[PDB]
Amino acid sequence: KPAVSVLTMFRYAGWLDRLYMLVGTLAAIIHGVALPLMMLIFGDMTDSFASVGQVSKQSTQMSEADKRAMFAKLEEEMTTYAYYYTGIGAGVLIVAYIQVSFWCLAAGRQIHKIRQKFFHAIMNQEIGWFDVHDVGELNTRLTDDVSKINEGIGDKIGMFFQAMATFFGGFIIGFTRGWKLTLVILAISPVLGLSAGIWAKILSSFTDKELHAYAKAGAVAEEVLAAIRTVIAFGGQKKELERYNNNLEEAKRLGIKKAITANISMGAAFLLIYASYALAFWYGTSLVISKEYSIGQVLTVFFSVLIGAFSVGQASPNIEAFANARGAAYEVFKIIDNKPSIDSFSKSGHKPDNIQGNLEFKNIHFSYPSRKEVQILKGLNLKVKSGQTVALVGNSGCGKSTTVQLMQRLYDPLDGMVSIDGQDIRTINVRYLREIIGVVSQEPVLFATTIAENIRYGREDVTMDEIEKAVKEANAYDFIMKLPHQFDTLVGERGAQLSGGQKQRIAIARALVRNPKILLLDEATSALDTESEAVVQAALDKAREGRTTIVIAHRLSTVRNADVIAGFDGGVIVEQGNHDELMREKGIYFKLVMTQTSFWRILKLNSTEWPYFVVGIFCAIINGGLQPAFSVIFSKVVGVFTNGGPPETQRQNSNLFSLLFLILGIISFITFFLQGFTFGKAGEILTKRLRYMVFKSMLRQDVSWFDDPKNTTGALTTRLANDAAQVKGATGSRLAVIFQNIANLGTGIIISLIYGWQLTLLLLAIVPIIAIAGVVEMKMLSGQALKDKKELEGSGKIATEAIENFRTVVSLTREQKFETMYAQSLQIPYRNAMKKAHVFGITFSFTQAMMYFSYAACFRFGAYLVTQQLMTFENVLLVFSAIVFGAMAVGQVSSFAPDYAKATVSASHIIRIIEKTPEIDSYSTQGLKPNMLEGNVQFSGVVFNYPTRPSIPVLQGLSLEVKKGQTLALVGSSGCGKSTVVQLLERFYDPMAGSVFLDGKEIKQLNVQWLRAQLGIVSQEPILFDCSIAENIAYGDNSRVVSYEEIVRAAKEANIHQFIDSLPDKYNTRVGDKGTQLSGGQKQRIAIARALVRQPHILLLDEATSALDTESEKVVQEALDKAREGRTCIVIAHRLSTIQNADLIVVIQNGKVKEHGTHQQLLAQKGIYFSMVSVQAGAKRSLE
């Protein structure tokens, strides 16, 4: 929204910059005017051949006589025109170079200054300014916004003015050559302009707004893959796949509809373009027959005006470029223009000598920039004598730290004054104040350089001797000297991570090199190990004795030796004095003291449809064959009119052409819509097949794969959408266009080649060169782009280091250091940006000059050698068209290149994800399917390590046995060991060693589905999909539809019926947060219902009461208790009071069963279980 003035943005351009911009925009306007002048001569050429074209055919008597005057006229005229063209070429060359080079130079020269000034301004901000702002946003703002600004003031301006110049010049020549055709075309201008803009909007659809139509399936996919363990447990995979398939089924239909409409639109647009284009020309001919216009003039004005018309369209984007740049420059300059109160880059104020370090805080009221919300310091009074050391203590609020905060003048106080020696702190220079004050902070930071440098960040001028004495006086010498590389060792976030105390000591050394008169120590001893604490404490004590010191910490071991101790309450200073006095006071201090004591294989998948392709390619080849027919006509339109001879026959002939001229148009509506519709419908179907085959195979994989940190629901849904979205683009429109373009160039080149002898062979030498010359330029553009990104990446890295740790660097000053380093970092990209302008200009001008010089060789060879022969102009005009547009059609091959690459990378994954097979597949029909109902469960010598974390074993030699119709209670110290039983019985994993049986058969050889079909699993936080609760209950049994009275019975067994009959919708109510909300109790009871609607022989209750409270636990436990006792059961629940009735209790220890037996037996014994029960039991009594 907010923007910037035009003159302020360029404030950093002076002297040579303005000159570059002037000469640049000048040369640009010249370059702009250059083109329409080309089309102006083109009419004069037509008149030359037209004058001879009429006279040559008018004779029909003498032959040789026509070999004299005509050839001479063509000689002088063609030579003149060619000379001019050659003249234009050098011009466009020079002016192009000047333009792009100068503008790029200006841009670079400015942006450099912008960056430097901006970073300086960033560093110049006071801390209060940072406290209210996001640093990440600010740095990213730097790096991105400066780039936007760069894009804005760049060569884009030259292009804009050049476009405006083509616009004006085109319309000038257009009007001056004649007024009528221009206005007619100006009636055409809105018509066509309305068509082309819409066409472009239709093409751009590939970016993702696609969610609106698709997301319906994505929702199913997400809740499924989020619920994967539940759908796995209940084996409802076929259903989920079905749902997803249905949603896809809808999606494809919406897709083909969109395809139809879009194709119709594009076709209609093309028709409008055709019709108008032809109509204007027909009116032109209608004007030529009246002898009001020359045949060439028509061409001149037509092309000049249309040029002028589209110039606008291609001009517009540069406006937005300059537009965005102002808006970006706003927030940038805001910081540069911002002048703070504190500065610290300022040289001003007193720099006192012989500071004794007498400090006093007088009546200081303060609040951080949370402002009125909280006032932390209400009044204050404090003094500290020179050479003394004061210790600040407090219960909370950290008003203690506030003093150290203010003493550096990071903030100026609301009311009151802090006074160092006799003078107000605000009278003395900031930098000097900061330099006379040393600081040691709780969390020490070390910038990434050698230790020496970090010690050198104390003072820029220092010798290794001072470093040595400094670290040795901090007693950090030993620890670092033992380290390799000596002082040259590396430190930072990345690499050489050291002990906190060591880092603190290095910090103290850095502070010690500062040789400060004033020392501020804030909780530097705190948040550190007790052993190294004394080591660092020695240093801290040794860091004093030359200085006055204010210290703050939570450890009262260091306070006793302080000269004065100061307590705070609610921001109010209260207790002050020596230790004994404060202990005699028995106040806050005493209180705290006492308190602390080549893949075509996917193309083979599209081979499902043999048709729908041949149609589109045949049609698109016919379109490819239809395209140059447009050029053949235009040739003969101007051709017969030039070759006319007697005029009488012309009017009818020109009129029959303009008819036909349109006839290829209307037929172009049929063919274009076809090849777009066949390829489109073909695109939406395989998108169903792929996503269906991808998703399916994703439900095949076991839990082992879903536990992978590499694969998460979002990543899977993303991988699911993208690849399927991408492969469509490669097999889609692009291919059709390529075939259309090769067919286009092919038919074009056949016609051209068979008509012009060596006229075409010539062009085929020229055209592939300028095309390849066009591609290589884009390659150099990306190379310089990537290389530049890498260099500023290094300069942006030192900025991030500076502004993220900023609150430290301000304390140490040396911001100027980072200024200098940042500059030296920038210096390399700067010299690089100078070469950029030199290159960008040459590559541009070379490509323009080649196209203009090529245009000279065109008519020069077309005339002279060819026209001196019996070969004719009408063919020349045909060939140039045909060939050049064959080329401009080939350009789309280069333009469409990356799609296949991206699609290949995306098509690489999508096959792999299908071809991947699991260890345990739920799809296999193999496995025993025993006939015997009664379950038991045998765990024997089981060892299990989770595939994700094969470090700490959960299970080692676990062995369990539980008979039918009896409850197995499972207790454990902690961990998934209790759950892993339930996970392994469901067979999400096969254990590393050992084995598990049910009826005595090994489940490993058993059918997986049949196995999971007999299990009653109920988890902690049951996930219910969005659908009727009856459908969530009916989810308990698949491959069969559940009866109403059955889910009723199951609902009755689960005691949820109170809710279900209470709801307005009853069993048809929707749950899962889309249509309704329920608490954990209802959800759980539903889980119970779906558990026992399955009628399992084995119930598995995994911490069912985990998240729950009050009566809910009671009723749910009642339900669960009612659910069991008729079945085999394994209950791991954390309430042991509810396990007191269990057939077998088993205490798990380190993966081995430790204690096992009935409650009273484990109670008779005194051991782990007794403790487990004793700790939680009577805790209710402790709660009383």
């Binding site: 284009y277 061409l299 050029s631 068209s881 050049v884």
Partner: peptide
């Protein structure tokens, strides 16, 4: 598509 650019 004749000589200017169309």
């Amino acid at each position: 598509x004749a000589x200017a650019x169309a």
